[PDB]
Design a binder for this molecule. Sequence first.
Ligand SMILES: O=C(Cc1cccc(Cl)n1)Nc1cncc2ccccc12
Ligand SMILES: O=C(Cc1cccc(Cl)n1)Nc1cncc2ccccc12
Lengths: 305, 300
Amino acid sequence: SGFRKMAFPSGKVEGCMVQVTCGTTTLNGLWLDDVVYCPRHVICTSEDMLNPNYEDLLIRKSNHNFLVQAGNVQLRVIGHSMQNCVLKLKVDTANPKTPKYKFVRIQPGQTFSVLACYNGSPSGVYQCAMRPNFTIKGSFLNGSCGSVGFNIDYDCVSFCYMHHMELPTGVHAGTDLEGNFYGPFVDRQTAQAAGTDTTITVNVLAWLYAAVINGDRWFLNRFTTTLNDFNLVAMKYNYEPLTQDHVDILGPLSAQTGIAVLDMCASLKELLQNGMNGRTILGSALLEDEFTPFDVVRQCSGVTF
Amino acid sequence: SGFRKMAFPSGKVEGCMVQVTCGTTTLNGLWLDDVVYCPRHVICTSEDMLNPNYEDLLIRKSNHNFLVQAGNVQLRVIGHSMQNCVLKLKVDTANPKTPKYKFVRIQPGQTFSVLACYNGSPSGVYQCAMRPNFTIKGSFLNGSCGSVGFNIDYDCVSFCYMHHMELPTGVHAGTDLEGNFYGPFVDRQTAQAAGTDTTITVNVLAWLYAAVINGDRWFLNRFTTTLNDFNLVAMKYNYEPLTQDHVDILGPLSAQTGIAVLDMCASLKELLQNGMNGRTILGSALLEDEFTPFDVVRQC
Ligand SMILES: O=C(Cc1cccc(Cl)n1)Nc1cncc2ccccc12
Ligand SMILES: O=C(Cc1cccc(Cl)n1)Nc1cncc2ccccc12
């Protein structure tokens, strides 16, 4: 019993974290095989950040301008290239701790674990979701750039996020490991803002199923609804639309608890229109949207890595 | 910016998790140097759990009755002894992945990371607090026994908890790594219940200071309180008493934000009286009590 915001075990990723220094800036790099990946903004000064020409700034750097430290060992940089907003530093040593990995680009609503790092040293691990507005509500201080997000699917680490920046509202923006930003953000010191965010409906439903599995049923009711009627309610309360794909994905949880997806939608509809009336669900007074249907099944079944 | 419930990176502990089997029972063990630590109830059958005599059950076991698996490698048990509610299995191989470590017994209100495991394999990591009633609100299924709680301040792993059982309310009970239970619990199937749980006041205050550090001040008020008047009110909401030790501990956060501890206590008293009025604090509609003053300074 119990339901916690749970991150994947971070060990496989900890063995990949390195410190990357370029001039006065120190941030984190991800060392996989003989390549260290890091945000391309490591090469910028504060003035360069105002309007950077990364190709021009990079052509002025030599391999020896990048100092890479793996623990207390300096790696020698033997090549450098840029792929979108990520810098790839070729090193002379393949990381002996390189796990089985893939680079995956996730969709809004998908969750992942973040291994927050400073000076190439892991400091903490937490779970978060890619918001519908493409930001992540992370916890990052100066020096955290290059920290990564990931999932583990069997014995394979799927890297999905690299930290690049903090927006003025305190939320975060980054890229996939191919350097493509999530959201309409750019790696430049210019006016940028997170768009209006919405609630990840399928994840709220998954969390309500987790609450039922954990013995919290007060919010259940005799009613059902249609996908069309529920989507009118979802739009009204700034909830993401629920698709037939989301309904299908929630099938297993619906079968286990005996509550149809549209039956759970009628519980959610009532919660949106009336609130919790002083009650809580899984120790929360808010509807939680950072657990996917897969996270709920995984946690409630004890899948290991 | 941002404030998350953050666990320590679990790698150092993942390299210590092993599977321990005794007869039909399988659970997790913690392999440090040449010793595997695990709950002593691994030697019990379902019929032994009401009134087990662990000394009598253990004397009947030999080293070869304990099968320890570390990844795909079987470790050879060359000795066994019981220390309180933990079984210590001496093995013929020192764990090459043994981190720098210590065993620490924590007090209620302290937080720690839990690396939940099944069959010696880590499944997930989450952050917990030792509740005032000595339970932990974990997330553990059958087979999670032997999973550990720890902190990793300054590269040294401080092991503080080993999971032993789930109480009828769904909360969890365990021991320190010397096998001493936290709370009045026993590793027996007898009727046991968690005592009335209370809110960890010093941690709620630490989290309000985290909210102020992160830019939120809506809950602040022009009032202060005496420590005794604060406790008289807070106890009416099932909050733990705030001691002068807690006030001293909050000194650094008070100095950083410019809000005196008793001034923050007056904000807390008002929050208890009014609720949040549709507002949130650090993304929560409830007062959070599983961040210590130390956690707040570490994260902010
Ligand atoms: O945002 C940046 C640097 C930056 C500025 C402009 C554009 C880009 Cl791509 N990057 N770094 C940080 C990342 N996360 C958290 C932080 C907290 C405080 C101070 C800096 C933080
Ligand atoms: O509580 C026990 C075993 C035990 C130890 C000591 C005394 C007694 Cl009677 N039982 N195991 C479990 C631990 N955590 C979580 C669980 C969830 C579901 C089923 C078992 C769980």
